[PDB]
Design a binder for this molecule. Sequence first.
Ligand SMILES: Cc1cc2nc3c(=O)[nH]c(=O)nc-3n(C[C@H](O)[C@H](O)[C@H](O)COP(=O)(O)OP(=O)(O)OC[C@H]3O[C@@H](n4cnc5c(N)ncnc54)[C@H](O)[C@@H]3O)c2cc1C
Ligand SMILES: NC(=O)c1ccc[n+]([C@@H]2O[C@H](COP(=O)([O-])OP(=O)(O)OC[C@H]3O[C@@H](n4cnc5c(N)ncnc54)[C@H](OP(=O)(O)O)[C@@H]3O)[C@@H](O)[C@H]2O)c1
Ligand SMILES: Cc1cc2nc3c(=O)[nH]c(=O)nc-3n(C[C@H](O)[C@H](O)[C@H](O)COP(=O)(O)O)c2cc1C
Length: 607
Amino acid sequence: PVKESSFVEKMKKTGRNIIVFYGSQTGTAEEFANRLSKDAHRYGMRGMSADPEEYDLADLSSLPEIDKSLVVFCMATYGEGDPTDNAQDFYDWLQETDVDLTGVKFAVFGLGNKTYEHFNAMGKYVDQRLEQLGAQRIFELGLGDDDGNLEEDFITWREQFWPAVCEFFGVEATGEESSIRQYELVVHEDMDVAKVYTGEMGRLKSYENQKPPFDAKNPFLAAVTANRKLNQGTERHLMHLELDISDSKIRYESGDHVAVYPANDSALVNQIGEILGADLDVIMSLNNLDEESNKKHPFPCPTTYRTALTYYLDITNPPRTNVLYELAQYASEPSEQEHLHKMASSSGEGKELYLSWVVEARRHILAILQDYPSLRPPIDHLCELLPRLQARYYSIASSSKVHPNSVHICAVAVEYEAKSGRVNKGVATSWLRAKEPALVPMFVRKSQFRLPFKSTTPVIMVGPGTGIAPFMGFIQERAWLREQGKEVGETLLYYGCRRSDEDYLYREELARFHKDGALTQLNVAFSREQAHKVYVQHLLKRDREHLWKLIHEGGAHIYVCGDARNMAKDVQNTFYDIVAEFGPMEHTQAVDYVKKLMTKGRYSLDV
Ligand SMILES: Cc1cc2nc3c(=O)[nH]c(=O)nc-3n(C[C@H](O)[C@H](O)[C@H](O)COP(=O)(O)OP(=O)(O)OC[C@H]3O[C@@H](n4cnc5c(N)ncnc54)[C@H](O)[C@@H]3O)c2cc1C
Ligand SMILES: NC(=O)c1ccc[n+]([C@@H]2O[C@H](COP(=O)([O-])OP(=O)(O)OC[C@H]3O[C@@H](n4cnc5c(N)ncnc54)[C@H](OP(=O)(O)O)[C@@H]3O)[C@@H](O)[C@H]2O)c1
Ligand SMILES: Cc1cc2nc3c(=O)[nH]c(=O)nc-3n(C[C@H](O)[C@H](O)[C@H](O)COP(=O)(O)O)c2cc1C
């Protein structure tokens, strides 16, 4: 592991009074942290972002040694209300700890989604725990909602945050504005092709000469063994991929996740270089104008613009308000420069404009640059404002017991008409779809979704659509525990699709698993073969009687995977309704009964 030296001392030697910590998994908490950090400057202060995993939060008790010190926590909730992987140490510390944080000023902005069981469990916990330890709070806990518009929640929070900080402290709004760069463009008018980054994530040339172990910092270029179309119809594109993980010493069980690092669309990369009048084949690097940080570049350098745009940056998701504000200065046409600046707006017509014209219309960077022709920003700066391309996760669709050498992926390619007028393409899926048996930089993330330990326990699997991914592994494995002489309890699947002749995923394989008894019951819900919708819940409601026999008397485990928005919630109320009917109890006590099955490892979600 190896922690970094005391962050308070580091702040002392750099004149920083505020540190902002990020509990990120996909770069959102990290992004917010960075914005708040650089914000401090225009308020008579100097901030600093930081990954908790790299430090000993115990040093928190030292922040008081710095004048007008402040710690902010931008945390995201994940798993069953669990903290993000980098926040684990911290979360764990917060508990065992006895430390006295007297004199510590803090504030917490949490990132969650009401769509889940444990809304901002992590954020709410950090804010609550630090106060117990003795630290004082200088601002109300923030509850951003990804389900609605997380970006806006953060803005209204940030808008109220700083003034309170300013008030509590002597500081105040200093000067007009800023427009300060984090990096310096050092053009390498000529450099050694062997010292140039071509798209690897960690060590230089790590993609070329592979060498275990492999992880998020060191992905394993797995070869694409197969890429099969699963959908019968033409409405959408659902595909099956098999990645060759031989000689990678990678370990995985059914239920785990596989992460992939994709490549943006080149037409979209080139057009950005083209409208910007820039040459993407310029070799360069952007070194931190702060020679005191670890983050020397905002991505592997030296590299070419083309490379950063292709493998290191996000050019398809809607630009955040701060990025747009920073760009406004490049709009020659004043009316256009207005719209841009006014989208960072505190609220009002501007907050209406950004939400509909950019987010709803789902305008990526290039689209903006096209609708505001007077906006031509220098390319080296745009690269500094663009967020990093994140790896995409997929629920490994195979069993290690059976395919220890391969990691399968069941996915639906994203492609749609945006409202922006253009057709959007899903980064990872469009990329995977183009792979023809072909390497995919990947890596596995251990999950909590797991078959039960004793092969005899009954399992109920509810996975509509692609939510069947992990279950293909589960079944593959149980089919194994039977072919292997072991005794297996009932294995039930509640799958759903549109029509059996359109997107019945794994129709054939699933039939074999039924004609062999690996699948006790194969209960499929064809949502569009009749005027009314027939969903999994309905099948569940139908078998209410038997399901209570496996749940209440059989000690069966419940697994739900798929859509979190509705399916998960719907499928849940049904289980409440079931329990509330059999071995009768009030509603309220049926929900507590159910919520108590998820606690005891018998009701697992993965949405
Ligand atoms: C733990 C985990 C497991 C997953 N398992 C699977 C799996 O087994 N199978 C599978 O197919 N996917 C799975 N996903 C989804 C997967 O990670 C990708 O999101 C999906 O493949 C698309 O990625 P993309 O990069 O191609 O799309 P992106 O370019 O990243 O775009 C996706 C975003 O576009 C937006 N969007 C999508 N459609 C529309 C529309 N019509 N209108 C407006 N906005 C839209 C949404 O904000 C969405 O978040 C999983 C995700 C997680 C976190
Ligand atoms: N977190 C994870 O581990 C994980 C794993 C796999 C997938 N996912 C996610 O789940 C989503 C699945 O997309 P998909 O295209 O593959 O599924 P889908 O095709 O959109 O839907 C699958 C089936 O479910 C039905 N359905 C729709 N609303 C429902 C509800 N409220 N209750 C019960 N059934 C409902 C559909 O019927 P109708 O279309 O007719 O309405 C259809 O028959 C993706 O956004 C993906 O990100 C997450
Ligand atoms: C698999 C998954 C699980 C999630 N679990 C939770 C959760 O338990 N609670 C919550 O409030 N939000 C949950 N969210 C919402 C995210 O925490 C929200 O999108 C957050 O902004 C992501 O932050 P990051 O980019 O910093 O990792 C989940 C999102 C995903 C994709």
